[PDB]
Symmetry: C2
Subunit: 366 residues, 2 copies
């Protein structure tokens, strides 16, 4: 709602660099300053415009329809962009050129801004997803994204994360039809998933892979091409940790996201069908090896997330077994782990009081 | 329930020319000894916090006008206090000498801050309280304003002009928005109004200063601190003799009108200055009358209506002066012919109007014999 103002004026947009919106506007040091000042003026104009926001009160009847959880139309926001795209360009203009350490910071800040906007506005979303003639901001992101990932620059750790939070929030706040505009993502998600990437990035890329997998023509963009296939990368990753910080909690977030992805894809309706089960078993044995010893009732939040993941994986595997009856064959390599876990996890879930006919039926099937 | 304070705080045109907005402040860094950068950072965070506060404020308001208290504003204050104490100690030092560009940029910042501060003093009441309430001693922000005013009201600094303009405007508003019980908390300004009123004082600043004298004259204890023996003497020498060679008649007219409203607010309750008031008002009626009459007819201009209104008010005020002093003619002697050439035309005119008042009728009738 109106909270967009509070969000934009959040003192540190990112922890560190102490750069707010103010620290973006008040900078007399692509546009050539023939538009820096004009854009700053648009910025504070839109600040006022939203600080009014007569709209999102007494229900805002126009709020409703598609765009799941209709984002409150904050038209004033539409005026911020030319600034934001000026800076995203000075990042791009500074890129595409075979220092930037400073300019890139303003770009990160502006990306956080755009993130909040896409989060809480609908007119900006209609604009961007509209005109293929993509609103210059979309291209300013995409031509960066490759540079956001391909180059492991010290700051390429963050600009990527923010551009991804933006792309994903924009796929969420919007509707299903426009996603073919997002189509351009698939040329860049692979680099976004390279084992040189950290947990938070692959996470956002998974979330977005899902948000696109809701689209009819988009699911095959998962593994239309059997080779490379924008998968078996996700699985080689989930199995062989390509990150070192690798805070187990983060890896749990990622297992959970990958699981929800697999489930949505399976229910909505590659060579990759084969590796998925191997990776799921590696993951599961990675979980059951943790909680068992602790035993008892999990009072830990991590434990509860793990249990949710395990139950969902069990149901998913039952669906798998429903398919590809060779699943025992492809499982041959790890049947050891599979039968060293399945019985104990069945015991556990039976111990759980939230059991489901699905959980019981599956665990019995195996 | 409105919260327009933020809409006010966010505008680059705050002071035309100076691009410094509230954001050119918050983002202030090492580029620009209690005033260490630590307090800069802390006050900037306080500002952002109070901003988040006011940006959401369901508010429903002896202040004589409820301006819905904006509790969040109170947290915008130490930033202003800091940027003011800077250039306050800076003027203290520029004088202590007996690097000015530092003071220049600094006072630009402080002007921006005084603007933010006047918007607050206007649209909030909790800020009014946090500003007026204090030791007498006094509250540090008010103390800073007053120490500064003297330094800009004195020998002109190229920016002292605007510094003083804004400080006087803030005094005016912090006087209006509050109640009468606290007025005497402003007493300390009677030692320093004169220089805000000196023979070298531009029209806007004096407009503000006399508006302030009239915002103050409600407080009896602060009422006579006119003729002590008399500030009005400077005011009248000014209203009659026109310094500020760069002065649009409209400015002189705003000032004349405010001085008339002042004389009125005083009348509704031993000065060489009180013998001179009449010379001033007579030359003043003559000025307005010679300015308007020749363009006789239905008053179509705005300034025309403004003038004629000033005229009705001045003539009523004169009739008052007469009832006050019988020697009225004795003092008028010096410009008696001005007075007797003006009053008849002013009477013909006042009758020509349809808004005639028994008083403007009686007063204008008694004098014109």
């Amino acid at each position: 709602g109106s909270i967009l103002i509070n969000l934009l004026l959040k003192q540190p947009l990112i922890p560190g660099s102490s750069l707010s919106l103010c620290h973006l506007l008040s900078s007399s040091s692509s546009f050539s300053l023939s538009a820096l000042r004009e854009a700053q003026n648009l910025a504070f104009t839109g600040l006022n415009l939203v600080a009014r926001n007569e709209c999102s009160r007494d229900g805002d009847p126009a709020e409703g329809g598609r765009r799941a959880f209709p984002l409150c139309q904050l038209p004033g926001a539409v005026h911020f962009l030319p600034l934001v795209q000026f800076f995203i360009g000075l990042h791009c203009q500074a890129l595409q050129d075979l220092s930037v350490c400073i300019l890139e910071g303003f770009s990160v800040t502006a990306l956080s801004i755009l993130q909040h906007l896409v989060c809480h506005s609908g007119a900006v979303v209609s604009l961007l997803l509209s005109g293929q003639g993509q609103h210059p901001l979309l291209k300013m992101l995409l031509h960066l994204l490759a540079f956001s990932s391909a180059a492991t620059g010290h700051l390429q750790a963050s600009v990527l994360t923010q551009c991804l939070k933006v792309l994903v929030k924009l796929a969420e706040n919007t509707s299903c039809d426009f996603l073919p505009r997002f189509q351009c993502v698939f040329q860049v998600l692979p680099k976004c998933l390279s084992p040189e990437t950290p947990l938070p990035s692959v996470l956002l890329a998974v979330e977005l892979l899902s948000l696109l997998a809701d689209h009819d023509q988009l699911a095959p963009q998962l593994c239309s091409h059997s080779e490379g296939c924008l998968l078996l990368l996700l699985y080689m990753y989930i199995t062989s940790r390509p990150d070192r910080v690798a805070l187990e909690t983060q890896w749990l977030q990622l297992e959970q996201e990958v699981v929800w992805l697999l489930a949505k894809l399976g229910v909505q309706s590659c060579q990759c069908n084969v590796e998925v089960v191997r990776a799921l078993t590696v993951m599961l044995h990675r979980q059951w090896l943790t909680v068992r010893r602790a035993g008892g009732p999990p009072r830990t939040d991590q434990q509860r997330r793990t249990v949710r993941c395990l139950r969902d994986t069990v149901l998913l595997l039952h669906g798998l077994s429903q398919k590809d009856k060779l699943f025992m064959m492809h499982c041959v390599e790890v049947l050891h782990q599979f039968d060293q876990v399945m019985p104990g996890v069945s015991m556990l879930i039976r111990g759980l009081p939230d059991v489901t006919d699905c959980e019981e039926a599956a665990l019995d099937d195996l």
